[PDB]
């Protein structure tokens, strides 16, 4: 029994981090065979960040100005090339502790566990949600660039994160290892913002599944709903449209627990009209959505 | 800025965990230089499990790690945890400590399947020396560590689930934390208390984080904050609690004093449909050291 935000093991992508230093600044980079892959700001000063021109920055570069750093040794950097938002240093040794591993662009909603990175030196793990707004929530300090987030399934890690930059709320984007962004987020010190953001409805049924499955049925109640009608509430509590792929999801759930998904889906719209009277729900006072409907099978039932 | 439920980095244990068998049971162990550590309750079949234990031949243990064998040479016991002897080192043993934690203190634990971790949390050990984990049948072996620079510090392994949920277990000396035996009795969980000086650890958190809306130009004092913490069922508040807040009360301005009459507060008139840290609750699995540790950061 219990349900925690539980991490994936770390010691796959712990033997993959290295520290990248460019003149002044140093951060983390992932190193996957002969690869090194960074966020590219690392060749930027302060000021280029306003409107920095990464291409006539990086023509001016030697691979000697890049020092890479693994553990206590020095990797010799034998040649570089941008990819979108990330820097790929080709260095002289392979990885030894490379893992099994594919490059993966998550969906909003989907979790994984991010390795918290400073100078080279993972510092701790947790679990985090790709939010709707493209943002995730996540501790980040300086230095923290280049960390990496990641699912570990049969042995194959998958890297999904490369986090680039705090944004004013606190919250934090970044790209995939293609370098693309998540979001609408530029590697530039612009007015960006994250947009307002919504509640992952998918995944708070899937938790409520969860509480039936550990023992806990107090917020059930005997209505149904359509799913239109259910998405007209919804919306009203900034949660985000339940689509029909959502719905077909939750099926092996709604079968195990003999809770039909749109009866489910009457009993969030009660939570969101009462509020818990002093309840909790799996240890929680308020309505998780970090969890997905694949976590709950995973660590529910096996 | 940010603020989670953060594990040590688990690479320096997965890299000791085992699968171990004897008879029908199949758990997890700790691979340390040439033993393996577990729970004495994997013994075939009141126990009395110095009789049990006896009866047992090394080839009745059989010890996995990933897909090799390790061959048992010798066996003893050590309180409610088994020691087995195996013919070869771990070469990936880890510079370690076997420490014994203090109620309110934390630690991450990594949950194991046939010797296959499979997922880290961070847990505290509660007053009534039960944690709130996450464990399924076949987790039992699973351990609980810190990491201090580079040495990994063990403090705890599972060996049982309560029947409210809640997980029960040794440190590796197979000492049990709480008042509780390896054998299928009635045994239940105390009734818990909340960890006042964590609680305090957090709300510095969700300060410097910006979370200011709970803090009061007023202060208190021990005797009379503790008078409230006794009634709302929070641990009594002790001046060594107080000394080691110490630094985050200088970091943000506000005394611990000072962030006990903000609690007492909050304890008295709830938080009026408002949050912190993203917690209608109020959260007591954070010490004082996880907090500087994550809004000042350490690496390992
Ligand atoms: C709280 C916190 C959470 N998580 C990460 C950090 C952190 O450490 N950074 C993120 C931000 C803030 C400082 C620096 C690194 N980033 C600037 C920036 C601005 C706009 C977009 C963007 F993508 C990066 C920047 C980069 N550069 C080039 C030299 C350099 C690159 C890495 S450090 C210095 N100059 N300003 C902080």
Redesign the pocket.
């Known amino acids: 029994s219990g349900f925690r935000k539980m991490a994936f093991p770390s010691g796959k992508v712990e033997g993959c981090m290295v520290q990248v230093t460019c003149g002044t ?3 983390n980079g992932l190193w996957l065979d002969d690869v090194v892959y960074c ?1 590219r ?2 060749i ?3 000021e ?2 306003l409107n920095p021109n990464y291409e006539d920055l990086l023509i001016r570069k030697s691979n000697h100005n890049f020092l890479v750093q693994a553990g206590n040794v020095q990797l010799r950097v034998i040649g570089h090339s941008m990819q979108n938002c990330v820097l790929k240093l080709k260095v002289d040794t392979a990885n030894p502790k490379t893992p099994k591993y594919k490059f993966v662009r998550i969906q909003p909603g989907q979790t994984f566990s991010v390795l918290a990175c400073y100078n080279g030196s993972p510092s701790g793990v947790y679990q985090c949600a790709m939010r709707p707004n493209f943002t995730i929530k996540g501790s ?6 280049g960390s990496v987030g990641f699912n570990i399934d049969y042995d194959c890690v998958s890297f999904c994160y490369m ?4 944004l004013p709320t606190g919250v ?2 970044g790209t995939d290892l293609e370098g693309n962004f998540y979001g609408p987020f ?5 007015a960006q913002a994250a947009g307002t953001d919504t509640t992952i409805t998918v995944n708070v049924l899937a938790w409520l599944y969860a509480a039936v499955i550990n023992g806990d049925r107090w917020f059930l109640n005997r209505f149904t709903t359509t799913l239109n009608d259910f998405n007209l509430v919804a919306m009203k509590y900034n949660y985000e449209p339940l689509t029909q792929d959502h719905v077909d999801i939750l099926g092996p759930l709604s079968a195990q627990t003999g809770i039909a998904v749109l009866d489910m889906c009457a009993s969030l719209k009660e939570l969101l009209q009462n509020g818990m009277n002093g309840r909790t729900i799996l240890g929680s006072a308020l309505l998780e959505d970090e969890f997905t409907p694949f976590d709950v099978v995973r660590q529910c039932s096996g």
């Not at 986090?163 to 705090?166: G, I, L, P």
């Not at 530029?186 to 612009?190: K, L, P």
Request: hydrophobic share 30%; with cysteine; glycine share 4%.
């Open positions: 600044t140093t951060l966020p700001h690392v930027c000063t302060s280029d960040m980040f300090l300086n230095g923290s660039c986090h680039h930059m705090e934090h984007a530029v590697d530039r010190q612009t």
